[PDB]
Design an enzyme around this catalytic site. Structure first.
Site, PDB file in Angstrom:
ATOM      1  N   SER A  43       0.786  -1.227   0.000  1.00 25.59           N
ATOM      2  CA  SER A  43       0.000   0.000   0.000  1.00 25.59           C
ATOM      3  C   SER A  43       0.821   1.282   0.000  1.00 25.59           C
ATOM      4  CB  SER A  43      -0.955   0.010   1.175  1.00 25.59           C
ATOM      5  OG  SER A  43      -1.930  -1.015   1.083  1.00 25.59           O
ATOM      6  N   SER A 104      -5.339   3.636   4.443  1.00 24.64           N
ATOM      7  CA  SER A 104      -4.938   2.547   3.550  1.00 24.64           C
ATOM      8  C   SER A 104      -6.170   1.823   2.987  1.00 24.64           C
ATOM      9  CB  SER A 104      -3.984   1.566   4.218  1.00 24.64           C
ATOM     10  OG  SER A 104      -3.080   1.093   3.225  1.00 24.64           O
ATOM     11  N   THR A 209       2.288   3.615   5.245  1.00 25.47           N
ATOM     12  CA  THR A 209       2.665   2.232   5.495  1.00 25.47           C
ATOM     13  C   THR A 209       2.276   1.304   4.351  1.00 25.47           C
ATOM     14  OG1 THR A 209       0.571   2.076   6.701  1.00 25.47           O
ATOM     15  CG2 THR A 209       2.551   2.371   8.024  1.00 25.47           C
ATOM     16  N   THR A 211       1.812  -3.271   4.067  1.00 22.87           N
ATOM     17  CA  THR A 211       1.965  -4.615   4.585  1.00 22.87           C
ATOM     18  C   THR A 211       1.684  -5.592   3.456  1.00 22.87           C
ATOM     19  OG1 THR A 211       1.081  -3.878   6.726  1.00 22.87           O
ATOM     20  CG2 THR A 211       1.312  -6.239   6.363  1.00 22.87           C
ATOM     21  N   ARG A 217       6.798  -5.499   5.283  1.00 20.25           N
ATOM     22  CA  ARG A 217       6.318  -4.396   6.129  1.00 20.25           C
ATOM     23  C   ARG A 217       7.135  -3.170   5.779  1.00 20.25           C
ATOM     24  NH1 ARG A 217       2.249  -1.632   8.155  1.00 20.25           N
ATOM     25  NH2 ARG A 217       1.997  -1.717  10.411  1.00 20.25           N
TER      26      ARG A 217
END
EC number: 3.5.2.6
Length: 264
Positions: A43, A104, A209, A211, A217
């Protein structure tokens, strides 16, 4: 220990690989580790996607308050805002972009991809702003699959850090749009346990961020340490860690970065 050896210690002890690039506002290199290894974006691409949208707003080819209508078919894994707005029948371009960046939200991201012409258009924007490396091949959440070795849906830390710097400091957007996207990154709701948890509390930090399956990560963004601005991209792979341990790994990278910056 040095920046390099402290990152290598984390890699060895956590059975992880860490990709980091730090650049100055002009994209000049400050620090790096595995900086040209490819990693799945996950993302993190939603920040460049928002930049693409703002470029269109700036040029007049998109309008921020334009209503994007959708049905339940656009709800996919992790679509918190899109779900809430579903009964109303639309989100605006700006509502969707802000949800993509700060929550996200995958449905919101895919709604924007529908409007701009899909993954090919995202890739075209990377190329336009001087990034020949980053590539979006698929929509969410499948783009976050991170099949080992797959070069689809990847970037490198250095390419992405330079893209971040172009957007925030290199004039890709108007002053108003740049400030807006900066504030969105600062107000991100998903990064409290990752990079910014490892930075001094007086640094101005904004980030996005990611994942990915198979242990990815990631966290990309900027920090301003008193007067000095930096763009940063961190991508990590740690297949055997728990989700919380991966958050802590990224926070630890934040600490290693801080120790370097405070060296100074």
């Amino acid at each position: 220990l040095t920046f390099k050896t402290d990152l290598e210690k984390l890699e060895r002890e956590k059975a992880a690989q860490i990709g980091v690039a730090i650049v100055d506002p002009q994209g000049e290199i400050v620090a790096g580790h595995r900086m040209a290894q490819r990693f799945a974006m996950g993302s993190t691409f939603k920040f460049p996607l928002a930049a693409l949208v703002f470029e269109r707003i700036d040029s007049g080819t998109e309008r921020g308050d334009r209503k994007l209508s959708y049905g339940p078919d656009m709800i996919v894994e992790w679509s918190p805002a899109t779900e809430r707005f579903l009964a109303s029948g639309h989100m605006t371009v700006l509502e969707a972009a802000q949800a993509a960046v700060q929550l996200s939200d995958n449905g919101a991201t895919n709604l924007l991809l529908r409007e701009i012409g899909g993954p090919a258009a995202m890739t075209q924007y990377f190329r336009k702003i001087g990034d020949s490396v980053s590539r979006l091949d698929r929509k969410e959440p499948e783009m976050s699959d991170n099949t080992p070795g797959d070069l689809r849906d990847t970037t490198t830390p250095i390419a992405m850090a330079r893209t971040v710097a172009k957007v925030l400091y290199g004039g890709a957007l108007t002053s108003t749009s740049t400030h807006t996207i900066e504030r969105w990154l600062i107000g991100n709701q998903t990064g409290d346990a990752t990079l910014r948890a490892g930075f001094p509390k007086d640094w101005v930090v904004g980030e996005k961020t990611g994942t990915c399956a198979n242990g990815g990560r990631n966290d990309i963004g900027f920090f301003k340490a008193q007067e000095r601005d930096y763009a940063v991209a961190v991508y990590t792979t740690a297949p055997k860690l728990s989700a919380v341990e991966r958050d802590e790994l990224v926070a630890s990278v934040g600490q290693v970065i801080t120790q370097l910056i405070l060296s100074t």
